[PDB]
Amino acid sequence: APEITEEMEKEIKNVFRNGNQDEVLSEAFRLTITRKDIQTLNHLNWLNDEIINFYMNMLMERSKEKGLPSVHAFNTFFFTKLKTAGYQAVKRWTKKVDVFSVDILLVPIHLGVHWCLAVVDFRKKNITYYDSMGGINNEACRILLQYLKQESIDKKRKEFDTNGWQLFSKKSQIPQQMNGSDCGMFACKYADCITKDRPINFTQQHMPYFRKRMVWEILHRKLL
């Protein structure tokens, strides 16, 4: 929640200033973050898919620690593909992942010009939708519940059990966007506290600090 930002500000300003784009910085999970990618965290720029998916994989890496729920995060192209093309178009994206062996499923959702987060929590038996703009999208979780039913079959040949599987969206119970560009920041910071099993404590006033902190976190591949 707190943490300072030390001589990192010089390191953050070093990559914020202009250099040749496409120059790779930070490589993990067979993923690269070019200079163009990290530029989306500067000022009030719109975050892109490379920054979000890289951050989700870092939360995935932290999930292996004791005292934290195990997490599997879909890439930002999953929900868009599943909703528009059906389950059989994404049925083979999870041939090395048993989604029913983890505690939390992270589903980053791209909405053309907007980011949002849907979370599957097998512990609470919940499929929650998080929108920093206050939008309600219960159809998105009904899509994910139908995905789980078609995923328990085809992968385990078991009819998925659906008791207490609450499909709901958040209202004014999570901090709101207050501008028009910090959306990907809210989506990633939502998942950070959710994967830590900690309450969502931040507000919009923390986003400028979050953007520069994420720059250092991505470069060093270390979550703070």
Added chain:
Amino acid sequence: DHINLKVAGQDGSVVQFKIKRHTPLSKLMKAYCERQGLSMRQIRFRFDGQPINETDTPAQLEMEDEDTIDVFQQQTGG
């Protein structure tokens, strides 16, 4: 040895390729963007949901014959 595959774009257009294996797919990626005219920083080359980076080879990936590589574009959002 060698295997053929298709690189289907979001518009349903096919670009056929053959490749050796244990060789980086960086060259196949470069050839695809040289045709669409767009930068490669604009296009993501994903196979069966898995991001293909320049060091990935069809050996470490599951890719067999007549496989398909889905092509997606950059997602921005605010």
